[PDB]
Design a binder for this molecule. Sequence first.
Ligand code: ZYN
Ligand code: ZYN
Ligand code: MG
Ligand code: MG
Ligand code: MG
Ligand code: MG
Ligand code: NH4
Ligand code: NH4
Ligand code: ZN
Ligand code: ZN
Lengths: 368, 368, 184, 184
Amino acid sequence: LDAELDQLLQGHYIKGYPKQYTYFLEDGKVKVSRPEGVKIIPPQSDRQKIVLQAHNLAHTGREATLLKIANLYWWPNMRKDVVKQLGRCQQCLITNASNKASGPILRPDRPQKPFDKFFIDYIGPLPPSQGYLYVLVVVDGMTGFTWLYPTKAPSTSATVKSLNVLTSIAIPKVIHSDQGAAFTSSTFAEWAKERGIHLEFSTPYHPQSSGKVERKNSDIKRLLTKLLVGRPTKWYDLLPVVQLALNNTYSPVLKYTPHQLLFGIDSNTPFANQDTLDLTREEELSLLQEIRTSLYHPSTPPASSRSWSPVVGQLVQERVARPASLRPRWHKPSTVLKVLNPRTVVILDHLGNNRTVSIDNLKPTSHQ
Amino acid sequence: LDAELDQLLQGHYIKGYPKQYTYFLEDGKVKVSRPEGVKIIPPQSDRQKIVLQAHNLAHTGREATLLKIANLYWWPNMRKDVVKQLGRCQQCLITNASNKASGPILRPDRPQKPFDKFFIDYIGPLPPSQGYLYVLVVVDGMTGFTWLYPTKAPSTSATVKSLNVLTSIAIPKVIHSDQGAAFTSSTFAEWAKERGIHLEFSTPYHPQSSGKVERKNSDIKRLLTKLLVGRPTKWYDLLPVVQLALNNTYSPVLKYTPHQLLFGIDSNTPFANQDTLDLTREEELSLLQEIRTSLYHPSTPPASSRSWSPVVGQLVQERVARPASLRPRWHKPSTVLKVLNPRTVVILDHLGNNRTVSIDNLKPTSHQ
Amino acid sequence: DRPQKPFDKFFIDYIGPLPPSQGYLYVLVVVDGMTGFTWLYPTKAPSTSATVKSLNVLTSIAIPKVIHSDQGAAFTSSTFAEWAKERGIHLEFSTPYHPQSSGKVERKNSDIKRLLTKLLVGRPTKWYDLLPVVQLALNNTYSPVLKYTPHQLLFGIDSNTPFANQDTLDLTREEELSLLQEIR
Amino acid sequence: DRPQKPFDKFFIDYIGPLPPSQGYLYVLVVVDGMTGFTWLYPTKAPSTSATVKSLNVLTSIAIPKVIHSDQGAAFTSSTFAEWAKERGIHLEFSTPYHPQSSGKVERKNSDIKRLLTKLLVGRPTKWYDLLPVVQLALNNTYSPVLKYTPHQLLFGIDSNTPFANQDTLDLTREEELSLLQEIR
DNA sequence: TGCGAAATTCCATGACA
DNA sequence: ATTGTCATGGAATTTCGCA
DNA sequence: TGCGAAATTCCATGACA
DNA sequence: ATTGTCATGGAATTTCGCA
Ligand SMILES: CC(C)n1c(C(=O)N(C)C)c2c(c(O)c1=O)C(=O)N(Cc1ccc(F)c(Cl)c1)CC2
Ligand SMILES: CC(C)n1c(C(=O)N(C)C)c2c(c(O)c1=O)C(=O)N(Cc1ccc(F)c(Cl)c1)CC2
Ligand SMILES: [Mg+2]
Ligand SMILES: [Mg+2]
Ligand SMILES: [Mg+2]
Ligand SMILES: [Mg+2]
Ligand SMILES: [N+]
Ligand SMILES: [N+]
Ligand SMILES: [Zn+2]
Ligand SMILES: [Zn+2]
């Protein structure tokens, strides 16, 4: 501070202050003649305060803070002190956006069998139709085969009623859902245990995780829309038609309809495929097994040129879910306990709770 | 139809039906033995009906429609008849999404002078502060210099009151705004004409068009948020501080604060730049003129590998603005009258009105 | 002649009246001919209407080429014939008083009655809730003749609920004395 | 010694009372020393409070190093001194009864009074609405001494509202007879 | 053993609000 | 304790029909 | 006339709801 | 009759201090 700057004035060399510039005194302060002009060299004991005053004017990041400081001062390695501060500004850390994108999405393996995994989700509220406002959508993971049930609410009770009817047909090993009130209730957990079904939940606020059913919602809404063009939106009576229509629609990449993957043969619907007419059922199911295993499976896309991947013990911040007007979009920093996979992590949140969280709902805390 | 298929059965060659396959009769219908199997060749007079029945099952696109048809039929150039139909399905055309992105954004030239162009916009509603709920934001195009005014509504009357106060300082040639109720009212048009100010409007529902002011809203909300961390959102009293803070913040790419571009010299604010201390004002303004013209200007980015650009007389569809639940996201097709620039067009909308519209709010009608 | 397949033939029939359960009185029974797969729908009446309402659920999953039934009123009505025609389903009737199905089906229908009877005793009023489990049972029941269960034939996979316990299906002596007591 | 610059010195002063306009009675007048740029703020009183309220608007646009004023009550109060100190503005007072500004400023302040007087006659009650145009005028008025208008010196550009009509600024004989009549 | 055209496959785009 | 998906329709590539 | 480190410039990312 | 923008903080590149 005052010691360092003294040795300097009397012409000695101090590590960090380049020798070729003349360091004088004037108005009671140590100055220096840099190419840009004459800047005050404050004593180290003042530097934190200066960086902070600069930063606080508009809570600026690295360069915009430096440029304020540089107007009056110079010292060795200014940006280091600037960055030190940015890393300690609570307000900056919880308010700024990220500028690093998530690593490339995983493409989970397709469930191996029909009924291995259900994905379920609600659609709505829709325009009242027969007193119904929602649709329970159940999509078999492997086949894409889909069941639709109209409901009056996205409630556990309505979920349970619908799934009793569905599971008359078969019982799935696993049901995957998002964290909607309906699926996370203890009543629903019971209902599942009662049947030996494992409940599997998406990381919260990350519907891509229910992507199988979500994507089917799109088709359901799309077809419903087309069928209701120029008519009043009376959808309740179309659910069955829509279901049947979708279950029997070809996926151009697979070359199969979900019905075909589920049953290995078309039922009595229009344009039924006849290719296995001469095979015995047993020859048919044998061929179905081979078709099921040989389906196209997409791969993880290339990482964007500026992505981040979670590392154990990294400081990261979880996105606030429903941030109020003029309130920070991020929670305070927290630590990566476990890296479940490159896109899913467990974090200890300073409260501290364990939360299993999508990397998409995280940013890495800046400036370490 | 029945004529064509006759000549064929009796072993003659008809253009389009390849010679090397045997075309017989069976159950009163013309059949053929193709590698895939035996398919019925319907009479041309039946083909439109067949394509339509297939398509209508789930209103499927090209391949998914073809695969249904191929199950039972074959004829020459099936997809041609399929595509013909897709192009005529009202419901498909107004309900499906686009799969072609907009051409690359324009980067308009920076206004040449302060006061050449204002961009204005409202922010809010915010949490009530002193009975105020909105903020009028006025951003000078060239400088980025910004004025803020709290309002009780995004109303013309409040716009007029604020701008009388602002235009005490100078009068702008042009004020650019979006199509908010406040800016499109005839009262506001009068107020502008009265002062020789030209009103310039964004194509509707395309805020990127007010990008200069929009982007400033972000900074305004961001700083307000930080300043209100852990306090009640009492923003009214901070507007002045925020204004001053932002107007004096460096843009790292320009190396100037908006204040500097506006005045060519810092006022008495913290960390004022002193570099022009020894220049006369006139030397200063001379240097300001040179700084103003030499500012970085970005260029139009590369086109995405699957973009479209409007062509005069093309069939295009305008996105529905506030589409109701289960209703189409697109209006019926309409024609490009004029290509104002590669990102802005005039269309005749079958009503038919002239609408000036952003290419972002259009898709090109499929299948011509 | 082409081999037998699922969805070639649904055999439908009513069972009831039964004691009131959640306001229901009958069970429409659908058995797929080839697979022996069974679907059960509770109705309030053996009417064309209740049949159409119920078959609309099933036929929104899979459509049979042929429905076979006896000459029950509900199945011989012209409404039901119109319904079937719309969906391109051929209707097929056994001659009156002489019901013919298939061995596989007859046996299935037998199991259904007996299995019902067994569970409706003790709780003659809670059967509505048990229809799902009654079906799972029926469908994961191993076929003596074919090496497989209906589930297996339908879906081409093992089920996640196998019924390794091939049950008594007969009335235990406790139940005969309280079945000759219930209907008294 | 360094050349004179905008924001080096604001000269502030009140003008009033005037007739009620939208409930306002005074005008706080701020003139930038170097440029001669003028800002006008209507107040309801020549108080420290109304001064602070008004200067808070201006100083949220640009902050003077020095405010010069006479020894008006509102400017000599310790509240006003506290206010200035917060913003690092030095306060500067002309000795009582002997107001010194600068030539440029004195002339400016003269134009302001005369220009006001001219427009408040005929409409002594509509002046509030005219303050914006009064300022545009003052600021796009060519300086005899410097080759430029205040706008030009402030912003370094021509204005979009030049006032090529250098006006009479004097009371026409119609107005002297209805100004000696208005205040009667 | 190579041509022109049809068929099939590729794959960016966008929406599950 | 978990994880995107896939219809879509122009363009790119392969296959087909013929020689 | 070349090194290591600091400084500056680049630029994808995301939000103006 | 009109049209995206730019703070941000790691990484990439250039400049600086010294020799
Ligand atoms: C009710 C909660 C748990 N929930 C929520 C929710 O978080 N909120 C706040 C409504 C959503 C959805 C739910 O299904 C859902 O149950 C939902 O589908 N999308 C649409 C969407 C958007 C982007 C995508 F990539 C995908 Cl696949 C789907 C919005 C949010
Ligand atoms: C009131 C209308 C005309 N309006 C609307 C509007 O169209 N609706 C329906 C609210 C919007 C905005 C207005 O300012 C505005 O005035 C507005 O800023 N954004 C935020 C946004 C989103 C993406 C971007 F790229 C940019 Cl630049 C800004 C949302 C829509
Ligand atoms: Mg969803
Ligand atoms: Mg906006
Ligand atoms: Mg019967
Ligand atoms: Mg005075
Ligand atoms: N997996
Ligand atoms: N331009
Ligand atoms: Zn900060
Ligand atoms: Zn269609």
